Amino acid sequence: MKTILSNQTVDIPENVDITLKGRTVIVKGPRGTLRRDFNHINVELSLLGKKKKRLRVDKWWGNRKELATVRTICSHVQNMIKGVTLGFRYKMRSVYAHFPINVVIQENGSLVEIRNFLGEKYIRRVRMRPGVACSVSQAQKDELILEGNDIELVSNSAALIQQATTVKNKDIRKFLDGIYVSEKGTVQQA
Amino acid sequence: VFRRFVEVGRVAYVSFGPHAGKLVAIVDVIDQNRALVDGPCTQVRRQAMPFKCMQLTDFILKFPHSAHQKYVRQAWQKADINTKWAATRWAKKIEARERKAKMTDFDRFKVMKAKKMRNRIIKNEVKKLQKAALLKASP
Amino acid sequence: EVQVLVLDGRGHLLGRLAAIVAKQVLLGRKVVVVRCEGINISGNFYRNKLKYLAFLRKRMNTNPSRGPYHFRAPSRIFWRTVRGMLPHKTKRGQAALDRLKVFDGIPPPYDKKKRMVVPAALKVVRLKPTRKFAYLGRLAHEVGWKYQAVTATLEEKRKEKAKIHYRKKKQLMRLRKQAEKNVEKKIDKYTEVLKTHGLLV
Amino acid sequence: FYVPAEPKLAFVIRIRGINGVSPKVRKVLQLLRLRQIFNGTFVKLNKASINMLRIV
Amino acid sequence: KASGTLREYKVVGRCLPTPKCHTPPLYRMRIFAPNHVVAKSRFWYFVSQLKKMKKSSGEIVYCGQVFEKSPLRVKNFGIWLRYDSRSGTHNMYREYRDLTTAGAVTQCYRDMGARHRARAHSIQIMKVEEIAASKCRRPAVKQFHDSKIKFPLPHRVLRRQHKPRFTTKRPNTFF
RNA sequence: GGUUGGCCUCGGAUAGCCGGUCCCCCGCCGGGGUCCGGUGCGGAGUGCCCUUCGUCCUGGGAAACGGGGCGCGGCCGGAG
RNA sequence: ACGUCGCUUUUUGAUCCUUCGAUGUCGGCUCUUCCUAUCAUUGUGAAGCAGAAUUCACCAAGCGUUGGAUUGUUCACCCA
RNA sequence: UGGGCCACUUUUGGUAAGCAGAACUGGCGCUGCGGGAUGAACCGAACGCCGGGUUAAGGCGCCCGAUGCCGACGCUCAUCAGACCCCAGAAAAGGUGUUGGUUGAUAUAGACAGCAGGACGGUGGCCAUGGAAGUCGGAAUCCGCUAAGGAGUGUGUAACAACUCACCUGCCGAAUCAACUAGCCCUGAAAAUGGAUGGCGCUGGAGCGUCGGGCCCAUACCCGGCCGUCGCCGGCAGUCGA
RNA sequence: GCUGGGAAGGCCCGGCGGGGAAGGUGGCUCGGGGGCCCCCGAGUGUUACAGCCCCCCCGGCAGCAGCACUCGCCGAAUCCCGGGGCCGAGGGAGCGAGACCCGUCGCCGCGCUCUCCCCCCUCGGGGGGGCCGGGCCACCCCUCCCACGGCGCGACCGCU
Ligand SMILES: [Mg+2]
Ligand SMILES: [Mg+2]
Ligand SMILES: [Mg+2]
Ligand SMILES: [Mg+2]
Ligand SMILES: [Mg+2]
Ligand SMILES: [Mg+2]
Ligand SMILES: [Mg+2]
Ligand SMILES: [Mg+2]
Ligand SMILES: [Mg+2]
Ligand SMILES: [Mg+2]
Ligand SMILES: [Mg+2]
Ligand SMILES: [Mg+2]
Ligand SMILES: [Mg+2]
Ligand SMILES: [Mg+2]
Ligand SMILES: [Mg+2]
Ligand SMILES: [Mg+2]
Ligand SMILES: [Mg+2]
Ligand SMILES: [Mg+2]
């Protein structure tokens, strides 16, 4: 079955403005700007409000699989709005039984050095995605903070660290050491 | 992004098929491939028509769906689509194509002579403009 | 026809374009296909790369030097596709194959000429927008072509020169429109004839 | 309802060739004088002729 | 049975009068067939299943094409049918939109072939009724019950791909 | 032995395009942002250009800052 | 387990289509290549995976898979 | 001549066999031709030497004649896709891939899903016992307060404890759930030289199913020419310009 | 030509109406919009500031498988004209003059003259109307038989 019309609307806050260039969305807010094109999805995007700033995604004559993309686009745009207004902050706790995992943060927070993971002498060097800043928290002991605007990049960097600290040739239900994402929140808490 | 829609009252130009070259109005929609179609002032009786042979125009009439041909014709004559259509750039491009197709040998000869003179004058003026614009002595 | 038919390979599907080109060169026409790295193949890239790797596997077990020759340039890949549709083991088919020239990028003979397009072979009309496709340039580069980078740089250089040429052409057309509105009293007599006979709406 | 009389005349055309024909079909076709493909003949319709047409 | 565009036939038949019952009952059927020859054949096929009748022991007293009463009115058709699959026999209810009953039945034959690989000899139409929009059940049909229906034609495919076969300009899709 | 006018070029998009114009930055031209048009492409390859009977009297228009030089000499661009 | 569905042609049968104006019939030695239904090695997933060891499974045939006593042996068995 | 063989269907022995043996008709043998890429037997059609027309079976992206139709409707994405009688490779069993269909159930007296509260008392019910308390087991399967709660769905303890369900309730505001069924696709699906829808390739189809209009060509059919054979036991002795 | 003596449809605002509703017009209510005035979305439902369907008490006009290309089967109920391609086999056809320069011949279909008037172009030629009586059908009157179909009225027979 081909549904005649499937549309979804997202609301844009006052402090953030959205510009459309075809299927390329530019979301500019107080924390910076974000670009993302959706040329891989055949939808129409329209800006409706001069007062309340609604963005509408319409898909005409779509089947099941391509009606599944309307809310995907809407959620991506909402994540863009969230990133440019509040930002994204992923906390990572480093857990270990015996050997403390020593994480040092190199230039501007874009490079992470894991030293003593499970007592190994190999030094893990993980480079964050551009626009992502890593730091060692002051409130908690074994905690890293990854902050950025693009949720894609922030969570990809968190996954890079988590998969860098991976146990080999051992029962992973017993050897639980590693750095794991503990919380996925925002910055500015608003 | 879309500016023209299939809707009740939308006037469509039939591009091919038995009724090619005519205007119709969409009266109803069936099964996403066809429409009930009625051109009462363009000599197209009511019938089903695939959307593939339609090219939507910019005119939209106002009548309810599956209204009778009397009301479709009244809506067509009020705000007469025939004259409005003839005035559009689309219709006169069609007209130019038709009268170029029916050009005779003598008309082709006369067109060749007129085009010859027109192009020579235009290119002389073009050369004049280029030479005039080439006098640039400025900091 | 009697002139050389130059086709731009960008955005065209491999087999569709090859069938059209093969019939043209069998009809005695000289065909030049440029930008063979812009040719597309339907189906996703991994699938098409697997097809080419299976082609690479077919070699003469006794002497691979005698075995099938796997050409890695996109132009040679397209040329071999056309040869598959020609009767290349006859003199007629070999003459047809000789009437075909294929290039990666657009060399200086044909970069100053207008390039044709075959709509019946174009990806935009022939392939559903929701379907995946592979680039012949990428596929060739990953099966062993060595000149993807240099062809890209030369193509961007050519595109810069073409942009300059287009700006000049637009300037000339603006000047022609200004001239047309300038000499109008002495032109409306012939303009009327053209409008009467359907040229010049 | 007016039911018209069952037709009394038929035109019969042999549409298949002469290769690999079973003996009964062959005999009936010879009796109908259709010994060639695209040979036609008129047949007066009754029970006897209709049951011959059913064979072929 | 093959196809084409189907037509509806009212076929009326009966058993031959015998010295047991002089006036046998008359039976009427709706047959969707390419032509009246096929219509008579299908009538005998169905009445042989229903009653104990045969072509030899009976006669067809009428066979006439039933013209659509409202071929200018869009309507919804519900079709009850039964068909043989590869592993069983099933009853189906299907819905179509058309201007003619025979056109909707043709749609049904095309659709059964497309979705179930069912051939016309397997399909067996047993009821066709013009239903109301409020009585429709299939969402594909029901999505056209919109008084203010409106949709564009998004991705227009170039169909004259060979007139011209070679051209400078790449085609436009948005219209 | 063929052949029986030429086309001297944007990049591309396709749920989008093309053209033009006023303000800002790039050393006088482009890139943006407005704004204005066109879009079954008409600034259109279904298109455009050239268009060949030749001369002689002989007027009006176009031009007259014009045409033709296998005439010389110089310069510039083009390397896939 | 009781059942049931397959695949393979490295077993042995079944058949007798080719060869009886002849296709040299076992094994070993030598040498190349191929297959994967993977023994090891690379990368992984699972466990009745604490570690070590082992077992099951996936991508996978790139590389390797040995020296000997007895026996014509193929097989077999043992030493290392 | 007295070696037969093959195919539809019937049919015996055998696990089966391109095995062995029967019945019926046709064929190959003895037979070319169009189609099945290829092929003794399949499909069409049987043949003197030619011209024109038209077909069969089969086809019409290119090889390669013909769809260069503005063909119709759907289905289908395959990191081993599929692609036409015989025929040249697959099964049981699976899939929350998608598409149709059947039957049933819940819901504005508030469904479903989520987040959020309660999930009691007799009673640690009886018999089993080393400990079995709702949860190793054997029967029973009740009652009260209730909005509701099994003398218990599962995790867990030696046993408790502690979680969790089915059961009710808050928020949320409109449709939702389940079991089947069968199309295409996927898993099942492993062999040896490198290789086969015939190849190239094809994914708004050059795939699959149902249909249309055109069009292509056989030694077949029709018209005509010419050769020969057979038949008319055909005509002519009337050369009878009288 | 036939059909359901086509089905639909067009026009006559179809008129007196009756009824049904919904893919719900106006209006009303609610919720989001453009400078208390103009839109979009959701509810009420029966004409309103649109329309649709059915029955009519009855329709009328034109057209008529339409030259407004919606959907057939046909031709004793069928004729005219045109275009492309391939072909030209045969060779004594005279019953008549008694053939004589080569049978422009048979069957078939026609025209004119051996009758006389007219009419129209043309300078004798060309083109037209015919030229008297019969039937048969068309129109009016009333008139017989038969066939087929329907309806009614009996009389007989059979069957509750
Ligand atoms: Mg969310
Ligand atoms: Mg271990
Ligand atoms: Mg046969
Ligand atoms: Mg020898
Ligand atoms: Mg030898
Ligand atoms: Mg394996
Ligand atoms: Mg046998
Ligand atoms: Mg023999
Ligand atoms: Mg014989
Ligand atoms: Mg034969
Ligand atoms: Mg053959
Ligand atoms: Mg085959
Ligand atoms: Mg022939
Ligand atoms: Mg073929
Ligand atoms: Mg061809
Ligand atoms: Mg498979
Ligand atoms: Mg007619
Ligand atoms: Mg002759």
Curated annotation (Swiss-Prot), chain A:
Q: Which residues are annotated as modified residue N6-acetyllysine in the UniProt record?
A: K121
Xref: Pfam families: Ribosomal_L6
**Claim: Ribosomal protein is one of the keywords in the record:** yes
Q: What is its main location?
A: cytoplasm
- Could you give a single Gene Ontology term from the biological process aspect? cytoplasmic translation
Localization annotation = Cytoplasm
Q: Which UniProt keywords apply?
A: Acetylation, Cytoplasm, Ribonucleoprotein, Ribosomal protein
GO terms of molecular function: RNA binding; rRNA binding; structural constituent of ribosome
Matching InterPro entries: Ribosomal_uL6-like (IPR000702), Ribosomal_uL6-like_a/b-dom_sf (IPR036789), Ribosomal_uL6_a/b-dom (IPR020040), Ribosomal_uL6_CS2 (IPR002359)
| S-adenosyl-L-methionine listed as a keyword | no
Example GO CC term: the record gives: nucleus
Note the subunit structure: Component of the large ribosomal subunit.
Role description: Component of the large ribosomal subunit. The ribosome is a large ribonucleoprotein complex responsible for the synthesis of proteins in the cell.
UniProt xrefs under PANTHER family: 60S/50S RIBOSOMAL PROTEIN L6/L9, LARGE RIBOSOMAL SUBUNIT PROTEIN UL6
Family recorded in the similarity comment = Belongs to the universal ribosomal protein uL6 family.
- Give the protein's recorded name: Large ribosomal subunit protein uL6
Source organism per UniProt: Homo sapiens
Curated annotation (Swiss-Prot), chain B:
- Does the keyword Ribosomal protein belong to this entry? yes
Keywords recorded for this protein, A-Z: Acetylation, Cytoplasm, Isopeptide bond, Phosphoprotein, Repeat, Ribonucleoprotein, Ribosomal protein, Ubl conjugation
Q: What role does this protein play?
A: Component of the large ribosomal subunit. The ribosome is a large ribonucleoprotein complex responsible for the synthesis of proteins in the cell.
Provide the species name: Homo sapiens (Human)
Output this protein's name: Large ribosomal subunit protein eL14
Cross-link Glycyl lysine isopeptide (Lys-Gly) (interchain with G-Cter in SUMO2), sequence positions: K123
Annotated positions of the Phosphoserine modification: S138
Q: Which residues of the full protein are shown?
A: 2 to 140 of 215
Q: How does it assemble?
A: Component of the large ribosomal subunit.
Molecular-function GO term, any one: RNA binding
Coiled-coil blocks: none
Q: Which family does it belong to?
A: Belongs to the eukaryotic ribosomal protein eL14 family.
Per the record, residues carrying N6-succinyllysine are K84
Q: Where in the cell is it found?
A: Cytoplasm
Q: Where is it found, in Gene Ontology cellular component terms?
A: cytoplasm; cytosol; cytosolic large ribosomal subunit; cytosolic ribosome; extracellular exosome; membrane; postsynaptic density
Curated annotation (Swiss-Prot), chain D:
* Keyword annotations: Acetylation, Cytoplasm, Phosphoprotein, Repeat, Ribonucleoprotein, Ribosomal protein, RNA-binding
- Spell out the GO cellular component terms annotated for this protein, sorted alphabetically and separated by semicolons: cytoplasm; cytosol; cytosolic large ribosomal subunit; cytosolic ribosome; endoplasmic reticulum; focal adhesion; membrane; nucleolus
On this chain, the residues bearing N6-succinyllysine are K47
GO MF annotation terms: DNA binding; identical protein binding; mRNA binding; RNA binding; structural constituent of ribosome
Tell me which residues bear N6-acetyllysine: K44
Q: Where in the cell is it found?
A: Cytoplasm
Q: What are the recorded Gene Ontology BP terms?
A: cytoplasmic translation; maturation of LSU-rRNA from tricistronic rRNA transcript (SSU-rRNA, 5.8S rRNA, LSU-rRNA); ribosomal large subunit biogenesis; rRNA processing; translation
Task: Tell me, in one coarse class, where this protein mainly resides.
Answer: cytoplasm
The text of the family note is: Belongs to the universal ribosomal protein uL30 family.
Q: What's the stated role of this polypeptide?
A: Component of the large ribosomal subunit. The ribosome is a large ribonucleoprotein complex responsible for the synthesis of proteins in the cell. Binds to G-rich structures in 28S rRNA and in mRNAs. Plays a regulatory role in the translation apparatus; inhibits cell-free translation of mRNAs.
The entry describes its oligomerization and partners as: Component of the large ribosomal subunit. Homodimer. Interacts with DHX33.
What is the recorded name of this protein? Large ribosomal subunit protein uL30
Q: Which organism is it from?
A: Homo sapiens (Human)
Shown segment, full-protein numbering: 81 to 136 of 248
UniProtKB/Swiss-Prot annotation, chain E:
Give the record's GO CC terms: cytoplasm; cytosol; cytosolic large ribosomal subunit; cytosolic ribosome; membrane; postsynaptic density
Q: Where is this cross-link: Glycyl lysine isopeptide (Lys-Gly) (interchain with G-Cter in SUMO2)?
A: K10, K127, K169
Q: Does the keyword Ubl conjugation apply?
A: yes
- Superkingdom of the organism of origin: Eukaryota
Q: Which residues carry this modification: N6-succinyllysine?
A: K75
Location in the cell reads:
Cytoplasm
Write the record's keywords in alphabetical order, separated by commas: Cytoplasm, Isopeptide bond, Phosphoprotein, Ribonucleoprotein, Ribosomal protein, Ubl conjugation
UniProt-listed InterPro entries: Ribosomal_eL20, Ribosomal_eL20_dom, Ribosomal_eL20_eukaryotes
Membrane-spanning residues where?
Answer: none
Q: Does the keyword Methyltransferase apply?
A: no
Q: Name one GO biological process term.
A: cytoplasmic translation
Residues bearing the modification Phosphotyrosine: Y62
- GO molecular function of the protein, one example? structural constituent of ribosome
Q: What's its job?
A: Component of the large ribosomal subunit. The ribosome is a large ribonucleoprotein complex responsible for the synthesis of proteins in the cell.
The record's family statement is:
Belongs to the eukaryotic ribosomal protein eL20 family.
- Put simply, this protein is called Large ribosomal subunit protein eL20
Encoding gene per record = RPL18A
